[PDB]
Amino acid sequence: VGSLNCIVAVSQNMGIGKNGDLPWPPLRNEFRYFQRMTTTSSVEGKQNLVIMGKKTWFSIPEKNRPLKGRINLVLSRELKEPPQGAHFLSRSLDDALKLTEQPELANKVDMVWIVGGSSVYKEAMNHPGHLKLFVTRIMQDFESDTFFPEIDLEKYKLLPEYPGVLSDVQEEKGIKYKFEVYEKND
Ligand SMILES: NC(=O)C1=CN([C@@H]2O[C@H](COP(=O)(O)OP(=O)(O)OC[C@H]3O[C@@H](n4cnc5c(N)ncnc54)[C@H](OP(=O)(O)O)[C@@H]3O)[C@@H](O)[C@H]2O)C=CC1
Ligand SMILES: CCc1nc(N)nc(N)c1C#C[C@H](C)c1cc(OC)cc(-c2ccncc2)c1
Ligand SMILES: [Ca+2]
Numbered sequence: 534v535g536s537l538n539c540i541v542a543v544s545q546n547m548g549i550g551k552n553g554d555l556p557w558p559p560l561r562n563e564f565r566y567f568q569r570m571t572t573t574s575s576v577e578g579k580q581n582l583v584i585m586g587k588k589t590w591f592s593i594p595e596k597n598r599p600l601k602g603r604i605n606l607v608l609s610r611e612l613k614e615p616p617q618g619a620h621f622l623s624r625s626l627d628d629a630l631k632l633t634e635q636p637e638l639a640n641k642v643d644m645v646w647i648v649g650g651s652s653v654y655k656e657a658m659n660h661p662g663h664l665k666l667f668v669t670r671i672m673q674d675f676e677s678d679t680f681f682p683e684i685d686l687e688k689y690k691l692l693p694e695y696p697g698v699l700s701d702v703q704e705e706k707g708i709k710y711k712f713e714v715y716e717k718n719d
């Protein structure tokens with residue numbers, strides 16, 4: 534794996550979660566974006582890998598687990614085998630990326646997507662090499678108990694536009710948001 538992607542939706546006060554759910558009402562098109570970005574593989578015959586923390590896994594409604602059309606990997610130091618329905622388990626991001634090299638996953642994975650939560654994003658954003666952060670800026674405050682680590686502009690650059698990503702402010706259910714893409718190469 535020579536490139537990692539992170540994807541997150543974040544409120545103005547840097548919130549990403551509240552009581553094991555999202556802080557804001559469901560945003561259908563924001564969800565469809567998440568689905569499109571994480572599911573779309575550029576290699577026929579391969580799937581993308583999604584990597585997520587334990588609480589994130591349990592935040593997904595059981596009926597939608599594992600995330601369809603993607604290989605689901607859960608991070609946990611405490612678990613001894615993957616949660617029911619997950620495909621893989623690793624104790625660290627490093628271990629997760631190494632597992633993609635092993636015989637089972639050899640030539641089955643295209644892109645790697647980190648999909649939360651806070652400590653997974655923190656480790657991923659500091660992983661060496663090319664990294665893209667797809668950040669949906671929800672343009673108002675929501676009461677939260679889980680937050681997105683601040684983006685180090687010494688390492689990351691905000692890309693002014695990006696192919697496949699809408700640039701204008703979006704609105705669903707009275708809530709304005711915009712899609713941002715950040716990138717570091719080293
Ligand atoms: N707005 C958004 O884009 C998204 C929102 N969310 C929301 O965020 C909340 C969940 O996120 P959060 O509370 O941060 O929890 P996490 O999903 O990160 O789960 C935390 C647990 O995951 C394991 N873990 C986390 N980081 C690592 C790591 N770097 N290496 C190994 N194991 C790790 C640990 O499990 P253990 O203790 O077993 O070792 C830890 O206790 C929910 O409310 C969810 O709905 C989640 C994703 C996206
Ligand atoms: C769009 C949400 C979202 N948007 C963006 N821009 N990045 C993300 N990382 C996520 C996210 C997320 C986590 C994995 C999540 C939390 C959740 O909390 C309820 C429900 C789902 C989910 C329910 C139903 N079907 C598929 C996924 C996913
Ligand atoms: Ca990439």
